[PDB]
Amino acid sequence: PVVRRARTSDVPAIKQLVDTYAGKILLEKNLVTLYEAVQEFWVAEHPDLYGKVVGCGALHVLWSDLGEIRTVAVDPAMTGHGIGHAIVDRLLQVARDLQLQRVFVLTFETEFFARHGFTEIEGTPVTAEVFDEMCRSYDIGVAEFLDLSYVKPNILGNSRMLLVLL
Amino acid sequence: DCRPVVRRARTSDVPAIKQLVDTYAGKILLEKNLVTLYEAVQEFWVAEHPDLYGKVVGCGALHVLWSDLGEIRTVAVDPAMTGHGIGHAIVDRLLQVARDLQLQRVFVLTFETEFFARHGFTEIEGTPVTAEVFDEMCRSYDIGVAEFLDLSYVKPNILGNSRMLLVL
Ligand SMILES: CC(C)(COP(=O)(O)OP(=O)(O)OC[C@H]1O[C@@H](n2cnc3c(N)ncnc32)[C@H](O)[C@@H]1OP(=O)(O)O)[C@@H](O)C(=O)NCCC(=O)NCCS
Ligand SMILES: CC(C)(COP(=O)(O)OP(=O)(O)OC[C@H]1O[C@@H](n2cnc3c(N)ncnc32)[C@H](O)[C@@H]1OP(=O)(O)O)[C@@H](O)C(=O)NCCC(=O)NCCS
Ligand SMILES: CC(=O)N[C@@H](CCC(N)=O)C(=O)O
Ligand SMILES: CC(=O)N[C@@H](CCC(N)=O)C(=O)O
């Protein structure tokens, strides 16, 4: 499973992957937001059809020592082949290369992420001072990490998970 | 003066980037709070101080706007270190990021008309995207994007800036 940095030509395929699960499962992403985020997105290619994109994932930095895995989606016709886990592996190595100590994820796929050492947590693990700084973010994923009131209706039932990197 | 090293930002650079932005924030540079700078760290570049190891004397970002279009934004040099080639070295590296990303056009909104003319930027009027791309880009939460789109509610804050474009 080859995982590589996304290119702008991958964005339509990424968009189709997100829309497949957008709603309760994945937070929506419109096209412009995906172009804007292309330098943090990664894609998995089909093993035998060169250059076809069957999965995507992004690592989003939240603070100096904290990152989040987000927008991990695998083509439903290509699941169960190691693609999801390979994307998470590469995204975690990005977090390491960026010298992050902790990675967050908000998800229903509790056991999938438990394979990588993520454990369920309660609350929001940042100081009160960092919490107030992060509230000025415009990114809705950040508000979901912060558990802000106006996104509470959209995330009910998700598990909050954290991985401390070695 | 010799060409400085321009490298990808690390999270430990973000406070210094923040101070560079705050120096010019307002009429010149769009404001950037800490969380936004951390979130954008994977598109920021910094010029290393010529003599102070691990210190940065300038910063800049390449922001993707669409499949074939990018923007140079948040270029800032320590005012006590200007006029030594650091600004141009950052823009040089940002333009190579744009080509590696297969962008055909790079935008900048700026008062420094001549600084950017050295790289081939020319002044334009309006917003060079189709009506369909314009409508998609309007859904962005990024204020710089709204400035690129020339939306009404940001017109008072960008008066006097030149809109410039470089075709790669
Ligand atoms: C969750 C999701 C990303 C997993 O995608 P996937 O491609 O099926 O993931 P994998 O194939 O790597 O692993 C699934 C199973 O395939 C099998 N597997 C086969 N080959 C494997 C390999 N080389 N490595 C690991 N597992 C493999 C395993 O049995 C694995 O079971 P496990 O998770 O209990 O270990 C996918 O279902 C999805 O897109 N869901 C919606 C988006 C979402 O929920 N994202 C999480 C929030 S961001
Ligand atoms: C505009 C700005 C980025 C330029 O920074 P800078 O480091 O002074 O840029 P440079 O030193 O590379 O070039 C400026 C002049 O110094 C001259 N220069 C002097 N010594 C030099 C040297 N050893 N090597 C190279 N150039 C030198 C250059 O000739 C140049 O003149 P030119 O533009 O006519 O070619 C900086 O003043 C700034 O941060 N302004 C506020 C933020 C801003 O306006 N950003 C733009 C919008 S994002
Ligand atoms: C898209 C994505 O990354 N998943 C959401 C889950 C919450 C939601 N569906 O709105 C999240 O914060 O991770
Ligand atoms: C940070 C940044 O780069 N801001 C605007 C300048 C316009 C403004 N809002 O002052 C720009 O395109 O240069």
Curated annotation (Swiss-Prot), chain B:
Coiled coil: none annotated. Its EC number is 2.3.1.1. It holds the Pfam family Acetyltransf_1. InterPro entries: Acyl_CoA_acyltransferase, GNAT_dom, NSI-like. GO terms for molecular function: L-glutamate N-acetyltransferase activity; N-acetyltransferase activity; protein homodimerization activity. It comes from the Bacteria. SUPFAM superfamilies: Acyl-CoA N-acyltransferases (Nat). Pathway: Amino-acid biosynthesis; L-arginine biosynthesis; N(2)-acetyl-L-ornithine from L-glutamate: step 1/4. It catalyses: L-glutamate + acetyl-CoA = N-acetyl-L-glutamate + CoA + H(+). One of its GO terms (biological process) is protein homotetramerization. Residues 4-142 form the N-acetyltransferase domain. Inhibited by L-arginine. It is an enzyme of class 2 (transferase). Belongs to the acetyltransferase family. Homodimer and homotetramer. Was identified as a high-confidence drug target. NCBIfam families: PRK07922.1 (NF005921). This is Amino-acid acetyltransferase. It comes from Mycobacterium tuberculosis (strain ATCC 25618 / H37Rv). The gene is argA.
